[PDB]
Amino acid sequence: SYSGYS
């Protein structure tokens, strides 16, 4: 998964 800011 991705968490945060992209």
Technique used:
electron diffraction
What's the CA gap between 5 and 3, in Å, rounded? 7
Locate 1 and state its tokens: 């998964």
| Composition of the chain by helix, strand, coil, percent to 5 | 0, 0, 100
User: How many residues appear in the chain?
Assistant: 6
Name where the chain breaks: residue before each gap, C-N > 2.5 Å: none
Structure tokens at 6: 């992209």
Query: 3 φ, ψ to 5°?
Result: -130, 135
